[PDB]
mmCIF file of C-alpha atoms and ligand atoms in Angstrom:
data_model
loop_
_atom_site.group_PDB
_atom_site.id
_atom_site.type_symbol
_atom_site.label_atom_id
_atom_site.label_comp_id
_atom_site.label_asym_id
_atom_site.label_seq_id
_atom_site.Cartn_x
_atom_site.Cartn_y
_atom_site.Cartn_z
ATOM 1 C CA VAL K 26 -116.573 158.669 29.732
ATOM 2 C CA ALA K 27 -113.475 157.166 31.006
ATOM 3 C CA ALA K 28 -114.117 158.483 34.516
ATOM 4 C CA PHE K 29 -117.630 156.599 34.544
ATOM 5 C CA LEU K 30 -116.062 153.183 34.766
ATOM 6 C CA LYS K 31 -114.333 154.336 37.915
ATOM 7 C CA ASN K 32 -116.629 156.810 39.892
ATOM 8 C CA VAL K 33 -119.725 154.266 39.716
ATOM 9 C CA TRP K 34 -117.164 151.498 40.805
ATOM 10 C CA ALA K 35 -116.525 153.733 44.036
ATOM 11 C CA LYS K 36 -120.498 153.782 44.608
ATOM 12 C CA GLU K 37 -121.929 150.206 43.448
ATOM 13 C CA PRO K 38 -119.625 147.646 42.542
ATOM 14 C CA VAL K 39 -122.481 144.954 42.813
ATOM 15 C CA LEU K 40 -123.993 145.090 39.195
ATOM 16 C CA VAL K 41 -120.664 146.156 37.621
ATOM 17 C CA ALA K 42 -119.385 142.663 38.726
ATOM 18 C CA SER K 43 -122.476 141.403 36.960
ATOM 19 C CA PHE K 44 -122.002 143.141 33.774
ATOM 20 C CA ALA K 45 -118.160 141.855 33.820
ATOM 21 C CA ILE K 46 -119.279 138.412 34.013
ATOM 22 C CA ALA K 47 -122.324 138.713 31.592
ATOM 23 C CA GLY K 48 -120.014 140.207 29.171
ATOM 24 C CA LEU K 49 -116.832 137.910 28.322
ATOM 25 C CA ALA K 50 -119.340 135.057 28.248
ATOM 26 C CA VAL K 51 -121.004 135.668 24.839
ATOM 27 C CA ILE K 52 -117.558 136.863 23.284
ATOM 28 C CA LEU K 53 -115.411 133.613 23.863
ATOM 29 C CA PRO K 54 -117.329 130.972 21.885
ATOM 30 C CA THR K 55 -116.407 133.097 18.754
ATOM 31 C CA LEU K 56 -112.824 133.162 19.857
ATOM 32 C CA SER K 57 -111.340 129.979 20.799
ATOM 33 C CA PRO K 58 -110.649 126.767 18.530
ATOM 34 C CA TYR K 59 -111.667 124.705 21.582
ATOM 35 C CA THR K 60 -115.349 124.982 20.283
ATOM 36 C CA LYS K 61 -116.372 122.926 17.283
ATOM 37 C CA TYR K 62 -114.550 120.253 19.262
ATOM 38 C CA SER K 63 -117.457 120.397 21.505
ATOM 39 C CA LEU K 64 -119.566 119.735 18.641
ATOM 40 C CA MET K 65 -117.150 117.146 17.192
ATOM 41 C CA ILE K 66 -116.925 115.115 20.497
ATOM 42 C CA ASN K 67 -120.604 115.159 20.772
ATOM 43 C CA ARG K 68 -121.385 113.806 17.289
ATOM 44 C CA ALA K 69 -119.437 110.397 17.550
ATOM 45 C CA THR K 70 -120.886 109.094 20.774
ATOM 46 C CA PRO K 71 -123.170 106.327 19.559
ATOM 47 C CA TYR K 72 -126.709 105.912 21.265
ATOM 48 C CA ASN K 73 -128.608 103.603 18.974
ATOM 49 C CA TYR K 74 -127.277 100.818 16.877
ATOM 50 C CA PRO K 75 -125.436 100.747 13.623
ATOM 51 C CA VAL K 76 -127.579 98.997 10.993
ATOM 52 C CA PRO K 77 -125.328 97.679 8.123
ATOM 53 C CA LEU K 78 -125.860 98.366 4.400
ATOM 54 C CA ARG K 79 -125.926 96.275 1.250
ATOM 55 C CA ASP K 80 -123.674 95.699 -1.665
ATOM 56 C CA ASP K 81 -125.150 96.549 -4.806
ATOM 57 C CA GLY K 82 -122.674 97.634 -7.761
ATOM 58 C CA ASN K 83 -120.874 99.832 -5.279
ATOM 59 C CA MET K 84 -118.879 98.736 -2.895
ATOM 60 C CA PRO K 85 -117.797 102.479 -2.122
ATOM 61 C CA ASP K 86 -115.748 101.474 0.981
ATOM 62 C CA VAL K 87 -115.994 99.647 4.470
ATOM 63 C CA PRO K 88 -116.252 95.836 3.964
ATOM 64 C CA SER K 89 -117.646 93.249 6.417
ATOM 65 C CA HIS K 90 -114.804 93.168 8.840
ATOM 66 C CA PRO K 91 -114.757 96.273 11.112
ATOM 67 C CA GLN K 92 -111.254 96.188 12.290
ATOM 68 C CA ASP K 93 -109.916 96.928 8.807
ATOM 69 C CA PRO K 94 -108.800 100.430 7.703
ATOM 70 C CA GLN K 95 -112.352 101.140 6.662
ATOM 71 C CA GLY K 96 -113.866 103.923 8.383
ATOM 72 C CA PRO K 97 -113.438 107.560 9.213
ATOM 73 C CA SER K 98 -111.145 109.259 11.953
ATOM 74 C CA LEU K 99 -112.845 109.188 15.092
ATOM 75 C CA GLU K 100 -109.605 107.610 16.837
ATOM 76 C CA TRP K 101 -107.768 110.886 17.573
ATOM 77 C CA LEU K 102 -109.746 110.717 20.711
ATOM 78 C CA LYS K 103 -107.595 107.832 22.321
ATOM 79 C CA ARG K 104 -104.562 109.613 21.596
ATOM 80 C CA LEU K 105 -106.049 112.764 23.087
ATOM 81 C CA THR Z 30 -112.113 171.817 74.171
ATOM 82 C CA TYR Z 31 -113.116 169.521 71.128
ATOM 83 C CA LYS Z 32 -112.717 166.474 69.491
ATOM 84 C CA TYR Z 33 -114.165 165.497 66.042
ATOM 85 C CA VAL Z 34 -115.012 161.948 65.245
ATOM 86 C CA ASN Z 35 -116.407 160.596 61.999
ATOM 87 C CA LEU Z 36 -115.587 163.824 60.063
ATOM 88 C CA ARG Z 37 -113.437 162.607 57.311
ATOM 89 C CA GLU Z 38 -114.091 162.383 53.680
ATOM 90 C CA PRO Z 39 -112.930 159.221 51.667
ATOM 91 C CA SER Z 40 -109.983 159.295 49.684
ATOM 92 C CA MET Z 41 -111.779 158.874 46.360
ATOM 93 C CA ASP Z 42 -108.827 157.945 44.041
ATOM 94 C CA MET Z 43 -108.086 154.954 41.960
ATOM 95 C CA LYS Z 44 -106.205 152.924 44.350
ATOM 96 C CA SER Z 45 -108.059 153.105 47.592
ATOM 97 C CA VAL Z 46 -111.439 152.082 46.052
ATOM 98 C CA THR Z 47 -110.041 148.875 45.146
ATOM 99 C CA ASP Z 48 -109.112 148.543 48.790
ATOM 100 C CA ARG Z 49 -112.596 149.229 49.471
ATOM 101 C CA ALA Z 50 -114.419 147.135 46.517
ATOM 102 C CA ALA Z 51 -112.224 144.263 48.170
ATOM 103 C CA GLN Z 52 -114.174 144.868 51.306
ATOM 104 C CA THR Z 53 -117.691 144.792 50.195
ATOM 105 C CA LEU Z 54 -117.473 142.141 47.711
ATOM 106 C CA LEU Z 55 -114.909 139.606 48.929
ATOM 107 C CA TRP Z 56 -115.302 140.217 52.825
ATOM 108 C CA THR Z 57 -111.972 141.249 54.164
ATOM 109 C CA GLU Z 58 -113.926 142.659 56.873
ATOM 110 C CA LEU Z 59 -116.413 140.349 58.944
ATOM 111 C CA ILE Z 60 -114.159 137.374 58.698
ATOM 112 C CA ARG Z 61 -111.063 139.158 59.808
ATOM 113 C CA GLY Z 62 -113.351 141.048 61.985
ATOM 114 C CA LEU Z 63 -115.361 138.528 63.869
ATOM 115 C CA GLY Z 64 -114.368 135.152 62.557
ATOM 116 C CA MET Z 65 -111.039 135.603 64.743
ATOM 117 C CA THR Z 66 -112.197 137.858 67.739
ATOM 118 C CA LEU Z 67 -114.721 135.519 68.915
ATOM 119 C CA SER Z 68 -112.545 132.318 68.873
ATOM 120 C CA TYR Z 69 -110.822 133.543 71.276
ATOM 121 C CA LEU Z 70 -112.701 130.936 73.311
ATOM 122 C CA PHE Z 71 -109.410 129.427 74.341
ATOM 123 C CA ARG Z 72 -109.403 131.233 77.780
ATOM 124 C CA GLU Z 73 -110.283 129.631 80.882
ATOM 125 C CA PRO Z 74 -113.830 130.213 81.882
ATOM 126 C CA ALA Z 75 -114.399 132.054 85.151
ATOM 127 C CA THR Z 76 -117.449 130.310 87.038
ATOM 128 C CA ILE Z 77 -117.762 130.085 90.689
ATOM 129 C CA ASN Z 78 -118.830 126.705 91.558
ATOM 130 C CA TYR Z 79 -121.664 127.987 93.696
ATOM 131 C CA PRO Z 80 -122.702 125.162 96.514
ATOM 132 C CA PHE Z 81 -118.838 124.622 97.152
ATOM 133 C CA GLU Z 82 -117.025 127.523 96.115
ATOM 134 C CA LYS Z 83 -118.141 131.136 97.117
ATOM 135 C CA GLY Z 84 -117.161 134.577 96.046
ATOM 136 C CA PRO Z 85 -115.220 137.073 97.561
ATOM 137 C CA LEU Z 86 -116.789 139.745 100.134
ATOM 138 C CA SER Z 87 -115.577 142.542 102.438
ATOM 139 C CA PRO Z 88 -115.419 143.098 106.233
HETATM 140 C C1 PC1 E 216 -125.120 148.016 29.330
HETATM 141 C C2 PC1 E 216 -123.933 147.096 28.704
HETATM 142 C C3 PC1 E 216 -124.068 145.596 29.073
HETATM 143 C C4 PC1 E 216 -123.155 144.797 28.302
HETATM 144 C C5 PC1 E 216 -121.759 145.348 28.583
HETATM 145 C C6 PC1 E 216 -120.696 144.316 28.096
HETATM 146 C C7 PC1 E 216 -119.730 144.015 29.425
HETATM 147 C C8 PC1 E 216 -119.180 145.123 30.033
HETATM 148 C C9 PC1 E 216 -118.197 145.035 31.110
HETATM 149 C C10 PC1 E 216 -118.794 145.936 32.201
HETATM 150 C C11 PC1 E 216 -118.567 147.304 31.796
HETATM 151 C C12 PC1 E 216 -119.130 148.197 32.873
HETATM 152 C C13 PC1 E 216 -120.554 148.187 32.777
HETATM 153 C C14 PC1 E 216 -121.203 149.450 33.218
HETATM 154 C C15 PC1 E 216 -122.266 149.550 34.218
HETATM 155 C C16 PC1 E 216 -122.948 150.891 34.144
HETATM 156 C C17 PC1 E 216 -124.428 150.625 34.896
HETATM 157 C C18 PC1 E 216 -124.513 151.383 36.297
HETATM 158 O O1 PC1 E 216 -123.935 152.057 36.403
HETATM 159 O O2 PC1 E 216 -125.798 151.250 37.177
HETATM 160 C C19 PC1 E 216 -126.272 152.600 37.332
HETATM 161 C C20 PC1 E 216 -127.605 152.188 37.875
HETATM 162 C C21 PC1 E 216 -127.726 152.311 39.538
HETATM 163 O O3 PC1 E 216 -128.652 153.156 39.744
HETATM 164 P P1 PC1 E 216 -128.703 153.285 41.787
HETATM 165 O O4 PC1 E 216 -128.304 154.585 42.049
HETATM 166 O O5 PC1 E 216 -130.022 152.857 42.042
HETATM 167 O O6 PC1 E 216 -127.681 152.150 42.405
HETATM 168 C C22 PC1 E 216 -128.285 151.205 43.030
HETATM 169 C C23 PC1 E 216 -127.444 149.633 42.382
HETATM 170 N N1 PC1 E 216 -127.631 148.752 43.311
HETATM 171 C C24 PC1 E 216 -128.728 148.077 43.369
HETATM 172 C C25 PC1 E 216 -126.659 147.585 43.092
HETATM 173 C C26 PC1 E 216 -127.158 149.057 44.773
HETATM 174 O O7 PC1 E 216 -128.289 150.629 37.830
HETATM 175 C C27 PC1 E 216 -128.954 150.431 36.761
HETATM 176 O O8 PC1 E 216 -129.623 151.217 36.275
HETATM 177 C C28 PC1 E 216 -129.391 149.050 36.317
HETATM 178 C C29 PC1 E 216 -129.658 148.118 37.433
HETATM 179 C C30 PC1 E 216 -130.442 146.710 36.810
HETATM 180 C C31 PC1 E 216 -128.929 145.819 36.410
HETATM 181 C C32 PC1 E 216 -129.573 144.501 36.229
HETATM 182 C C33 PC1 E 216 -128.340 143.408 36.093
HETATM 183 C C34 PC1 E 216 -128.455 142.773 34.790
HETATM 184 C C35 PC1 E 216 -128.037 141.357 35.159
HETATM 185 C C36 PC1 E 216 -127.297 140.618 34.284
HETATM 186 C C37 PC1 E 216 -127.678 140.503 32.724
#
């Protein structure tokens, strides 16, 4: 079968270039750790408005001042 | 006597197919062919300017 990938590429190298780009396209999102950053960037882009909550017992975290060390880690993008 | 033209098979190996598959797909012909042979416009045109200049003849 190892000649079939070289004795049709002497006759029609047209669709062979298509399968070579059809392949190596489905394969790569299962490979590089650059993906799931593509979902991590896409999650912390605020469209709507952040409504606040109310104190009742808890008090889990995040007081009235926003610039306190209160919220989660989305500040790795400015270092990126 | 004789002469044979267009009587030659291709090489049909691993090397020279890439030499031909660079031709069909990425056009090593048809630009080196006729994007250069045409231009080549940089010669002086040869036009007889007829009401004033006239052409050669013979006695
Ligand atoms: C089939 C597996 C697909 C997934 C492969 C994963 C990637 C692998 C990387 C490429 C490896 C090599 C691929 C083998 C190609 C063999 C096909 C072949 O030889 O064609 C025979 C025959 C050739 O028969 P033919 O003699 O008429 O040749 C004419 C070919 N043209 C038109 C180009 C001049 O081709 C076919 O039967 C299929 C043609 C339809 C192809 C539709 C393209 C799909 C578009 C992208 C999706």
